[PDB]
Amino acid sequence: IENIGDGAEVVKRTEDTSSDKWGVTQNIQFDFVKDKKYNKDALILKMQGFINSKTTYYNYKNTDHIKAMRWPFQYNIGLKTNDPNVDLINYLPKNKIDSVNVSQTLGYNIGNGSFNYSKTISYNQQNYISEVERQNSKSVQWGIKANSFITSLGKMSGHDPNLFVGYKPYSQNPRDYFVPDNELPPLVHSGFNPSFIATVSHEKGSGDTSEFEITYGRNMDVTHATRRTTHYGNSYLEGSRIHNAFVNRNYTVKYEVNWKTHEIKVKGHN
Amino acid sequence: IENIGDGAEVVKRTEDTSSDKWGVTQNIQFDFVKDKKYNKDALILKMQGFINSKTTYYNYKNTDHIKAMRWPFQYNIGLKTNDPNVDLINYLPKNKIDSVNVSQTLGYNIGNGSFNYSKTISYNQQNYISEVERQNSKSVQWGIKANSFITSLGKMSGHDPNLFVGYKPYSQNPRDYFVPDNELPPLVHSGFNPSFIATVSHEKGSGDTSEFEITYGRNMDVTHATRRTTHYGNSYLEGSRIHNAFVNRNYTVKYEVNWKTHEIKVKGHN
Amino acid sequence: IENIGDGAEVVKRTEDTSSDKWGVTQNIQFDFVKDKKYNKDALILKMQGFINSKTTYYNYKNTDHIKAMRWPFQYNIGLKTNDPNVDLINYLPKNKIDSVNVSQTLGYNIGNGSFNYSKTISYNQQNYISEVERQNSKSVQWGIKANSFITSLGKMSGHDPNLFVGYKPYSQNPRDYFVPDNELPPLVHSGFNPSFIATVSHEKGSGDTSEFEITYGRNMDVTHATRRTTHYGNSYLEGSRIHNAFVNRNYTVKYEVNWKTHEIKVKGHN
Amino acid sequence: AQHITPVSEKKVDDKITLYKTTATSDSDKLKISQILTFNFIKDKSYDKDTLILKAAGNIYSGYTKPNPKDTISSQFYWGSKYNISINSDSNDSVNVVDYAPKNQNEEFQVQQTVGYSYGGDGNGSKSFSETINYKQESYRTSLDKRTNFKKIGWDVEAHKIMNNGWGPYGRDSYHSTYGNEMFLGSRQSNLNAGQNFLEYHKMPVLSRGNFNPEFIGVLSRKQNAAKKSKITVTYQREMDRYTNFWNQLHWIGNNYKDENRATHTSIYEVDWENHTVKLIDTQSKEKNPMS
Amino acid sequence: AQHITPVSEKKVDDKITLYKTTATSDSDKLKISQILTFNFIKDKSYDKDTLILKAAGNIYSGYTKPNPKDTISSQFYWGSKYNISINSDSNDSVNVVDYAPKNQNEEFQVQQTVGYSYGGDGNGSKSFSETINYKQESYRTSLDKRTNFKKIGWDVEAHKIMNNGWGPYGRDSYHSTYGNEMFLGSRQSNLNAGQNFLEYHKMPVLSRGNFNPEFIGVLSRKQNAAKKSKITVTYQREMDRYTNFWNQLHWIGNNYKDENRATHTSIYEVDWENHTVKLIDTQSKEKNPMS
Amino acid sequence: AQHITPVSEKKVDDKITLYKTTATSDSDKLKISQILTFNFIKDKSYDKDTLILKAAGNIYSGYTKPNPKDTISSQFYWGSKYNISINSDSNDSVNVVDYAPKNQNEEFQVQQTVGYSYGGDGNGSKSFSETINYKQESYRTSLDKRTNFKKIGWDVEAHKIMNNGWGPYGRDSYHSTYGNEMFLGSRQSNLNAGQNFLEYHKMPVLSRGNFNPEFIGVLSRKQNAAKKSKITVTYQREMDRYTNFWNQLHWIGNNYKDENRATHTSIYEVDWENHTVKLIDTQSKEKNPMS
Amino acid sequence: AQHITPVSEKKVDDKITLYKTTATSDSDKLKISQILTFNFIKDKSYDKDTLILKAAGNIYSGYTKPNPKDTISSQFYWGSKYNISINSDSNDSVNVVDYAPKNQNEEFQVQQTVGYSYGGDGNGSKSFSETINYKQESYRTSLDKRTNFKKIGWDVEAHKIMNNGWGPYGRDSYHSTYGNEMFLGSRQSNLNAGQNFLEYHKMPVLSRGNFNPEFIGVLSRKQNAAKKSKITVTYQREMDRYTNFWNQLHWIGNNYKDENRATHTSIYEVDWENHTVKLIDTQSKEKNPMS
C-alpha cells in the first residue's frame, strides 16, 4: 500500500512555542501534503521539542532523616481535534507485539550420570517505553514511562521503590539521599525530546480552519529516602514512592490550520 | 540463463473459488507472459489461497477414557493438464540437497591426562516440509508434511505417536486430552496458506483453450489419547496414531485457459 | 549541513619537499575549491608524506652493561598561518569521546549455594593514538603518541619503562639489548605516513598570498636497558626511560598560497 | 512464499494508476477505532479493479483492574484474543484475492552435540545435548476459519506469557496444585487476593493495554459490475477472566476463557468509479458489560 | 525518532537554494575556539529562511598538572563538564527549530538464563543468571535546562571514568574509607601526594586534553523580519578540583565539583539577505584564574 | 574461479540478441522427466552461436519400501547415485564450452588452541585442541569422467548420511561386527527384519524421494556448420540394495552397490537458425526391473 | 587515512584523460620479473602530468634445499626480506607524490573481564583476564628508510613464522638452550642434520617459494620539463642462512641474517608526451652466488 503523502509535493510550516511555567517547548513542523492521488486535504505533523524533567530534591517537613526526589515517571504527548471533518489516518510510533529470542538446551552426560536443562531469553530494553494510551479518529495520546535502568548490580524497574535511592544517610543535603547525576538517565536528569508523527485528513473545500490541540507534559512521582538503622547500628536509605503524585503537568497549545492557504495560527496555550 | 517471462509484458487475470464442503479457497493469479524472445505461448500460475486445517476433537465410541484428535498430517497441492501441446517448464519450490554445518573438535589436556572429542551439527527446521511427490512435463504435486514441532522438553517429530497428547486424563472434554491451541502450530490449529508457482508453455496458434486442474487439500491423521495408570495409581495420556486415516480430502477446480484472448473460465470443481 | 567544498569544482596542486637532515618528506596536495555557494575563497590541504622514525641503538658512555634505544615516542603534525584574513574551518582527525562495550553478569547457583558476578569491557586500541594538542582559528597541532603494543604475555603501554627491552644481557651489540625488528611496530622501526586534512577560508579579493607553515617531526625518548643480576647469579635487562629526551625534531616548510591564480610557492624550510 | 512478477518486466506507459482514500469508524464506548487506508489501482495489464485496504487503528484489550479490597478471592478481565475481518457481499462481484499476514510455517534452529572423553594415568564419558533457538511472540496471529473467497479474518491470541521469570503460560496452562498461574502474584502471599496478581506493568501490552492492528486485504472487482458495493470490517476483542483464590494452604489461579467479547462492525460503501469510501452503518456490542 | 518527509516527494524546480559561510572566534587565553559553519537555505516549499549552524572547534579541559613536590596533600583541576549554547534574541523573529544531538532514551540488551540439573547413579541444582550489555561513554551529552524556542544548549559531563581497572567512577563517587578514588593513584603508595594520582595518559582525553565539539542548531527566520539579527554562541568549561591526602594510615581522595569555570561567549551579526555572518562581540571570563 | 569480462566493457549497439525455447521428455515408467530450457545467443563480438541449456525436471530415487513381513532378512533399493549428461555429436561443429556446477576444491575453517596453567598456594597443565568447521552435504555433485569437449556429465552420489544420530555413513561404511549400518534400525530390535530399518522420513530425500536436478551446459556452434544438429541428454539413477540380517545374536546390515540402474536418454534436434529444439528420440531402460 | 576529494565534486567535461602502457624486465638467472603497468593521466584541474605505476611480477625467495646427506651440521638459504623501490632522477622534474601500501599503525581488540564469587552453606574468589585479538601476517610490509620526494621503497620482512605449532619465530628468535628454532625439525631427532628441518611445505611461501609483489607509486611531472625522463625500479631479495647442529646432547638451530642478496634494477625511459615506457638498462647482481 502507498501512504497518503508518498509522491506528493509538500508545503512546510513550523511553529515553536515555549512555556516558562511548564518548562516545555513544542517545535511542530506542519507539512501540508498535496497528494494529487488522494481525494482529501492531508497534513503531516511532526511533533518535536523539549520537556524539561523538572526533577527536584527537597527535605521532608519537620525531620532531618527523610528527603525527597520528585521526578518524571512518565512524559505525556497528545494530539486532538474536535473537527468532525478531520480524521487521524496515521501516527507513529504504535504499540507492537512483544517478542523475545529463546534458546533451550537439554542434555545428558553418562560417565555417574546426569541430565541438564537450560533456557535463555534475550531481548532489548529502553529506559522509557512509549505506549499508545488511547487513540481514535480524532486524537492519540502516548505515555512515555519509566521502564528499566542499569544500576551497579543489575537493572531496576521504573516501579521499584528503591529506584534512585542513594548512599549518604547522614547528609543534610537532600540531593545526597539520591544516586548522583551520572547514574541517572538523561530523561530524569535533563528531560525528554519527543519525536512523534501524525497524519490527518480533512474533507475538501469545507471550512477554512480546524483547531488542533497538542499537549506535552509530565507525571511526577516522589521517592522518599528514609534513613533506617540496623539493631547493631548500621544506617542506610530505604525508598518509598508516591506514585502519580503530580499528574498531567501539561502544556497544551492550540493551532488553527488553514487548509487552503497553508497557514498556521498559534492561538491559545495554558 | 534467462527464464521465460524475464523482460516480458504480462497480462494478469485472477480467479478466487471456495468450497464450503472441503474448507478450501484457491486464489490463483494467471500471468500470461508476452515474451517476444520465446517461440511458444507462456503462462505463470501463482497458486495461493487457504486450506482450513479442519482439526477436530471427539470421544472414542462407548468409552470415556480414549479421545481423538483428527488433524492435517499433510497438505496437498497439485497442478495438472492433459493437453499434449502444454509443458510444465518451471515450478517452485523444488526439492533441495539436504545440508548441515559441522564443527568437530579433538583435544587433550596433559596435566593425569585426557583426550576429548566433540562434534556439533547445526541446521534449520520448519513445522512442515514441502517435497515434490511427483513431477513430469504435464503435472507437479507437492506434499507439505508435519515435520518438527517445539515442545517444552525439546522437539518432536511429525511421526511421534505422542505428538499433541495433552495433560488432563480425567477430563470429559475431548479437547482436553490434547495440548492447548497456543502449543499447536498454526498449520494444525488454523490451516495452510500455500504459495506455489508453475510456468507452462503452449504450442502457438494451436487450439483455443487448455484445461488445467488445480487440487488443494489435506491428508488427516487421527491421534488417540488413551488414559493409562501406573500400578501405584498415577494416570496420564498415551498417544497412538492412525496414520493416513483420511487421505486426499481434496478440492479440485478446472480452469480453461484461452491463450489468444487471455481469458480464464472456471468450469467444474468437486 | 553541507561542508564547504561539497559540490564544488577543484583546482589541484601538489608539492613534495624532503629534508635529509630531519629525515622527513612532506607530500602536500592543495585543492582550491571553487564553491559557488560559499562567499569566501576555500582551500583543502591534504597533508601526507613520510617521517623516518630515526630509531637508533648505541652503548652508554664508559660501560659495557647499559645500552640505549632512542625512538619516536610521538610524531608531530602542525599547520599554522598568521594571516588574519584566513580561518581554519575544518580539520581531520578530531578528538572523539572515549567509548567501551560492557557486559555485566550476576547469577547464582543454589544446589551448597553461590553468587557470581562478572564484568567484561571490550574496546579497540592502536599502537599510536592521534590527539589534537591545540587548535584555534589559525592553527592545529596533532601529537601521534606511543599508546599500546602487543608483546608475548599481553600488551604494554607506550609509557612502560620496560617497553622494547630485549633478551641478551651479555651481548656487546647495543641492538641486542632491545626486542628484534619483527617485535617492533612499523611506526618505531620504519616511521610514520601521516594523513591529515584541513580546510581553510580566505576573505575574498583581499591580498595576493597567504603564508602557511606545515611542521612534521618527532619527539624521541631514550630507553636504557641495564644488565641486572639476581643474588643467585641470573642476569636480565631492566628498562628505564628518558621521556621527552629530544623534543620537536621537526621539519617546517613555508608555502605561499596565491588565492587568485591557484599557485603555490614553496619558500623556506628549516 | 513465491513471486509471480518476472525479472525486469516490460511495463506499458502508465501501467498503474493509483487513487487513494481513507475512512474511519470509532466506537468510543468500546475503545475500538478502525482507521482504514485504501488504494484503488487501475492496471492496464488487468481486467479487474484492485483495492488494497489497510486496516489499522486501535482495539482496547478490555482489561479491568482487580479490586484491591477483594480479600479471599479476586478476578479481572484481560484481552485474550482479538479478531479482525474484511468481507464483501455474496451478491456483488468483489473477491478477496490476497492479504497479509498469512499463517506461519514456523522455523527454528537446531544444534546437536555429541562429546566423548577418556582420561587416565582411568575412565570415559559420553555427552549429548540438543539446543533449539526460536523467536517467541507473546501473542500469535493466524487466519480465522471463516476466511474464504469473499472474507479475510485474522485471530491474534495470547500465546506465551511470562510471569516474573516463570512460564511461559497461556490461557489453558494447568498445574495440578496451583491451577493456571499465568497472572498469579505468588503461591504464599499474605496480601489480599485483589493485590496478589502479577504487577500490571509486567503483563504484555496486548493483555492490559491497546492493540494497534495492521492488516492488509486486497480485493478485486469486475469492471462490468455495479459501480458501488459494500465492504464490512469487524474489529473485536475477546476477554478471559483470570481469578485467584486462597484455599487456606496456598493460592490457586484459574483462567476462564471467552467470558466476554466486545465487537465493532462497520459497513462502508465503496464507489469504485469515483474512488470514494463512506461509512454507512456501525454496530457495537458487548456480551456482558459491567454494571 | 520519526521523519516527516514522505516517500519519493515531488520537488519543484530549484526547491532548495543553499548559501554557505563560516565565522570563528577564539579566546587564546582560555584555549577555546569557536569554528562555526552556516548553511542558509531558501526553500520554495517554506515561508521562512532556514539557517543550519554547526558549532565545532576546541574547548580545552582546563586541566592543570599537580605539583609533584606536594608531599602530604595534593590537588589538580580537570575538566568535568562542558556547555555549548546557541541563542537568538527575544525581540527578533528567529527561533531554534531543531538541533542535534538530542537526549538519549538509552537502550541495552538483556539475557536471562535458568538452568536445572539432576545427576545420580543423587542430587539437583537450579541456576539463574542475568547479563546486561550496553555501551558506556566516558562523558555523556544531554540538553541544558535553559533550552527553549530561542536557545539550544548542551551539557557534556564526566560520566564513567575507569582508574587502572577500578570503577567506573564519577564526580560524586564515594567510599566511606577512601573518599572519591576516581584519580587516586593507590591507597598505600609511599610516593609524594603530588605523584600519587592516576597517570595523565590513562585519564580520558575530555578530562585532561581538548574537547572538539560538534553540535548542530537549526534556526528559522520570518521573511518579513529585519534582515540582520544577532546570534550568541557560548562555549564553556567547568572544572572540579581532585585532591588526595595522606591521613597517616592510607590515602584518601576527594573531588570538589564546580571549583572554576571558563567561558567564551561570542555574538555574531547574521545578515539573512546577503547570507553573511560577522563576529561583533566577544567575552571571556574565568571565575578563579590561577595567580 | 576467475572472470574474463573486463570492468565497464564497451558494448556495441545490440551486442546480444537472445532467443528462448524449451523442450521436455518424460519416461512415466521410470519417473524421470527432463525439462530443458534454452537460450540461443547471437553476439556480435563472437563468431559462433551460443546455446545455454538448463537441464531440470525430476529423477525418482527408485526407492522401494521393504516388505514388513520379511522376518529374518530384509532389503530395499534406494537411490545411491544419479548421472546427468549433455553431449553433441562428433561429426557436428558443436562443442561444450562451459557448465555449472564444477568440481569443488573444498574449504573449511581451522582453529587451534594451546592452553597452559599453573596454580599453587602446586602444579601445571598444558592443553591442545583443534576444531574444524565445514558444510556437509548428504549427496555431493562432481564431474563424470566422460566429460570432454563434446560432453558434460555430472554424478550426484550419496555422501554423508546420518542414522538417528549415528554416522555419517556412506555406501561402503563398514563395522567389523555390524556391517554397513547406514539404514539399520537397531542392533538388538525384536522387530521383523522388514521393520528394522531407519524410518523412511529420516532418510535423505535423494535416497527415498525425488531428485530435482538443475545443471547448466553452454555449447558453441560454428556459424558455417549445418543449421541443425542433435543434442543427447541422459538422466539416470543408480540404486544400491540395503539389507539387514538377524544372525541369532544381533542385526547385521549390508549395502550392495550398483544393484540396478534406470536411464532415460533423449535426443533433440536443435535448429540453430530458427532457434527451435524438437524431441526426436527417447530411450528408457532398467537393468533389473522387479517382477 | 583522510580524503581530500569533496562530496559530489563538479567535474568539467573530460576532466581526466587516461593513457595506459606496460613494460617488463626479467632476470631469468635470479628468477626476478618486473611487470609494470602505467596510467598517464592528463587532468584539466591539475597543472602537472600524473603517472600511476603498478609494480607487480615475481621475486623468487632464493630458497635452496638442504643436502639430506649433511649428517652433524646442515644449512639452507631462505628468503628473509624483499625490497622494491621506484625512483626518478634528481635533475628531472618528476616527484613521487603518493604510494600504497603505507606504514600500518596497527590495531587490535582488547577484552578485560573481572569475576567475583562467593559460595557457602564458605568462601570467595576474584578473577581477572585479558584477551587480545589481532591479525598476524607471516611477512610484514613497511617503508624503506630511503623513501623521499623522489623515491618510494618498501621492505617485506619475515615476521611471525610458526613451526609445527611452536613459535611464532622470527629472524632473531633465541632460546638459551636451543638457539633459533624457527625451522628446526626437532630437538632430539636421530635423522641426519640435512633431514632435520621443518618440512618444506609447512614453511611460508615467501620464505621458500615466489613472492608476487603488488605496489603502487604515483608520480607527478611538471608540464614545462623535458618530455622524456627515466624511472628506476629495483626488485631485490635478501636471504638468511638457517643452520642446525648436533652437539651430542641435542639439536641447536641458528639463523644468520643477510647472508646473501640478489637484486634486479631496471631503468625505463618514460616519454610523457607520447605516453610510452621503454626498458633501456638492466642490472642483476648477487653478493655470494653458489659454485
CSV table of C-alpha atoms in Angstrom, one decimal, chain F residues 89-234:
chain,number,residue,atom,x,y,z
F,89,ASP,CA,27.9,-35.5,-31.9
F,90,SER,CA,31.4,-35.9,-33.1
F,91,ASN,CA,30.6,-35.0,-36.7
F,92,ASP,CA,28.9,-31.7,-36.0
F,93,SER,CA,30.6,-28.4,-35.1
F,94,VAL,CA,29.1,-28.0,-31.6
F,95,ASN,CA,31.3,-28.0,-28.5
F,96,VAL,CA,30.6,-27.9,-24.8
F,97,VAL,CA,32.5,-24.8,-23.7
F,98,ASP,CA,31.3,-24.2,-20.1
F,99,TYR,CA,28.9,-25.7,-17.5
F,100,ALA,CA,27.9,-25.5,-13.9
F,101,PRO,CA,28.4,-26.7,-11.3
F,102,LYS,CA,32.1,-27.6,-11.3
F,103,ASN,CA,34.2,-29.7,-9.1
F,104,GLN,CA,34.8,-28.2,-5.6
F,105,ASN,CA,38.2,-27.7,-4.1
F,106,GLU,CA,36.6,-27.8,-0.7
F,107,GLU,CA,37.2,-25.3,2.0
F,108,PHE,CA,37.0,-25.5,5.8
F,109,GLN,CA,37.8,-23.4,8.9
F,110,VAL,CA,40.5,-24.4,11.3
F,111,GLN,CA,41.0,-23.2,14.9
F,112,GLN,CA,43.9,-24.5,17.1
F,113,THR,CA,44.2,-23.5,20.8
F,114,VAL,CA,47.1,-24.1,23.2
F,115,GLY,CA,46.5,-23.5,26.9
F,116,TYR,CA,48.9,-23.6,29.9
F,117,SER,CA,48.1,-23.3,33.5
F,118,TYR,CA,50.0,-23.1,36.8
F,119,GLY,CA,48.3,-23.0,40.3
F,120,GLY,CA,49.6,-23.4,43.8
F,121,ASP,CA,49.5,-21.8,47.3
F,122,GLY,CA,51.3,-26.6,43.2
F,123,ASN,CA,51.0,-27.8,39.6
F,124,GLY,CA,50.7,-27.2,35.9
F,125,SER,CA,48.7,-28.3,32.8
F,126,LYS,CA,49.1,-28.0,29.0
F,127,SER,CA,46.1,-28.1,26.7
F,128,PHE,CA,45.8,-28.5,23.0
F,129,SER,CA,42.7,-28.6,20.8
F,130,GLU,CA,41.8,-28.4,17.2
F,131,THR,CA,38.4,-27.6,15.8
F,132,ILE,CA,37.4,-27.9,12.2
F,133,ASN,CA,34.2,-26.3,10.8
F,134,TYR,CA,32.7,-27.3,7.4
F,135,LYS,CA,29.5,-27.8,5.5
F,136,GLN,CA,28.3,-31.4,5.0
F,137,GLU,CA,26.0,-32.3,2.1
F,138,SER,CA,24.1,-35.6,2.2
F,139,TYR,CA,24.8,-36.0,-1.6
F,140,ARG,CA,27.8,-34.5,-3.4
F,141,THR,CA,28.0,-33.4,-7.1
F,142,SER,CA,31.1,-33.9,-9.2
F,143,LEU,CA,32.1,-34.2,-12.9
F,144,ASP,CA,31.7,-37.6,-14.6
F,145,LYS,CA,34.9,-38.9,-16.1
F,146,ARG,CA,33.4,-39.0,-19.7
F,147,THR,CA,33.4,-35.2,-19.8
F,148,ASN,CA,35.2,-33.8,-22.8
F,149,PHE,CA,35.0,-31.1,-25.5
F,150,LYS,CA,31.7,-32.6,-26.7
F,151,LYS,CA,30.1,-33.9,-23.5
F,152,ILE,CA,29.4,-32.7,-19.9
F,153,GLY,CA,28.3,-35.2,-17.3
F,154,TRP,CA,27.7,-34.9,-13.6
F,155,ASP,CA,27.5,-37.6,-10.9
F,156,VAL,CA,25.4,-36.9,-7.7
F,157,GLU,CA,26.4,-39.5,-5.1
F,158,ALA,CA,25.3,-40.5,-1.6
F,159,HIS,CA,27.8,-38.7,0.6
F,160,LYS,CA,27.2,-38.4,4.4
F,161,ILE,CA,24.1,-40.0,5.7
F,162,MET,CA,23.0,-39.8,9.4
F,163,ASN,CA,21.1,-42.6,11.1
F,164,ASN,CA,19.3,-41.4,14.2
F,165,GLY,CA,22.4,-39.6,15.5
F,166,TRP,CA,24.9,-42.2,14.3
F,167,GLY,CA,27.2,-41.8,11.3
F,168,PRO,CA,27.6,-40.2,8.9
F,169,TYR,CA,27.6,-43.3,6.9
F,170,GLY,CA,28.1,-43.9,3.2
F,171,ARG,CA,27.8,-46.7,0.6
F,172,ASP,CA,30.8,-48.5,1.9
F,173,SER,CA,30.7,-47.9,5.6
F,174,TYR,CA,31.9,-50.9,7.5
F,175,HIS,CA,31.8,-52.2,11.0
F,176,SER,CA,33.5,-55.5,11.7
F,177,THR,CA,30.7,-56.6,13.9
F,178,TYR,CA,27.6,-54.9,12.4
F,179,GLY,CA,28.5,-54.4,8.7
F,180,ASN,CA,27.2,-51.3,6.9
F,181,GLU,CA,24.8,-49.8,9.5
F,182,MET,CA,23.7,-46.8,7.2
F,183,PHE,CA,19.9,-47.6,7.4
F,184,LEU,CA,19.8,-50.3,10.1
F,185,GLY,CA,17.1,-49.5,12.6
F,186,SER,CA,18.8,-51.0,15.6
F,187,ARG,CA,21.4,-53.7,16.6
F,188,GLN,CA,19.1,-55.6,19.0
F,189,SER,CA,15.5,-55.0,17.8
F,190,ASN,CA,12.9,-57.7,18.2
F,191,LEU,CA,11.1,-56.3,15.2
F,192,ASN,CA,10.8,-58.2,12.0
F,193,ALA,CA,13.7,-57.6,9.6
F,194,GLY,CA,11.3,-55.8,7.3
F,195,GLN,CA,10.5,-53.4,10.1
F,196,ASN,CA,14.0,-52.8,11.4
F,197,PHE,CA,15.3,-50.1,9.1
F,198,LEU,CA,15.7,-46.4,9.7
F,199,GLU,CA,12.3,-44.7,9.4
F,200,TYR,CA,11.5,-43.6,5.8
F,201,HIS,CA,11.0,-39.9,6.8
F,202,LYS,CA,14.5,-39.7,8.3
F,203,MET,CA,16.3,-41.0,5.2
F,204,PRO,CA,17.6,-38.1,2.9
F,205,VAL,CA,15.1,-37.1,0.2
F,206,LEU,CA,17.6,-38.0,-2.6
F,207,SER,CA,17.8,-41.6,-1.2
F,208,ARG,CA,14.0,-42.2,-0.9
F,209,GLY,CA,12.1,-39.4,-2.8
F,210,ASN,CA,12.7,-37.3,-6.0
F,211,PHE,CA,15.9,-35.6,-7.1
F,212,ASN,CA,15.1,-32.2,-8.9
F,213,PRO,CA,18.3,-31.6,-11.0
F,214,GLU,CA,19.5,-28.2,-12.0
F,215,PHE,CA,22.6,-28.3,-14.3
F,216,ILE,CA,23.7,-25.8,-17.0
F,217,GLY,CA,25.6,-26.6,-20.1
F,218,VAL,CA,26.9,-24.0,-22.5
F,219,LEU,CA,27.5,-25.0,-26.1
F,220,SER,CA,29.0,-23.2,-29.1
F,221,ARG,CA,28.3,-23.8,-32.8
F,222,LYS,CA,30.3,-22.6,-35.7
F,223,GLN,CA,28.3,-20.3,-38.0
F,224,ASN,CA,29.4,-22.1,-41.2
F,225,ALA,CA,28.1,-25.5,-39.9
F,226,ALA,CA,24.9,-27.2,-41.0
F,227,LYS,CA,21.9,-25.4,-39.4
F,228,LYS,CA,20.5,-28.4,-37.5
F,229,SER,CA,22.4,-30.7,-35.1
F,230,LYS,CA,21.5,-33.1,-32.4
F,231,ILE,CA,22.0,-32.9,-28.6
F,232,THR,CA,21.6,-36.0,-26.4
F,233,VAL,CA,20.6,-35.7,-22.8
F,234,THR,CA,20.7,-38.6,-20.4
